[PDB]
Amino acid sequence: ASWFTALTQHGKEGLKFPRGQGVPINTNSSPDDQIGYYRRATRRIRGGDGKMKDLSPRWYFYYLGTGPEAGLPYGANKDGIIWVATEGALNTPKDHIGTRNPANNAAIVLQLPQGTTLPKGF
């Protein structure tokens, strides 16, 4: 499980951030730790007609070296994965932060610093 709540893509543009932006605020992490990826999670449902459809994609953040793409190095090219890093982060895996157990931690509400650029529809 991600440490954070998702970003929902209500529009047609997939997620991306300008370099330096996009890492969720987490006061239980340090400057070196501010680096990772969002991963798209799509869900299907039965619509009100007889028919399966996609819900709006969700994008969940994971620290570098953790989560479903724990094996990927920063910048690796993969569909549904985008990368973010705050100025000064170390490009090292964040096993010390890891992923969340919902049994014993709520998700942290995803917040970005004042004035982050967001694609249309986030």
Resolution, in Å, please? 1.7
Report which DSSP code applies to 70: T
DSSP 8-class letter at 67? S
In the annotated binding site, the residues are 43, 58, 100
Experimental technique, in short, is: X-ray
Strand partners, 44: 54
Domain boundaries of the chain, sorted by first residue:
7-85
Residue 73: Cβ within 10 Å count: 11
List the binding residues for RNA.
Answer: 43, 58, 100
Contact 122, 57 (CB under 8 A): no
Reading the block at residue 85, the tokens are 């890093």
What are residue 4's DSSP bridge partners? Answer: 108
Which class for 75: exposed (0-12), middle (13-18), buried (19 or more C-beta within 10 A)?
exposed
d(CA 118, CA 122): 6
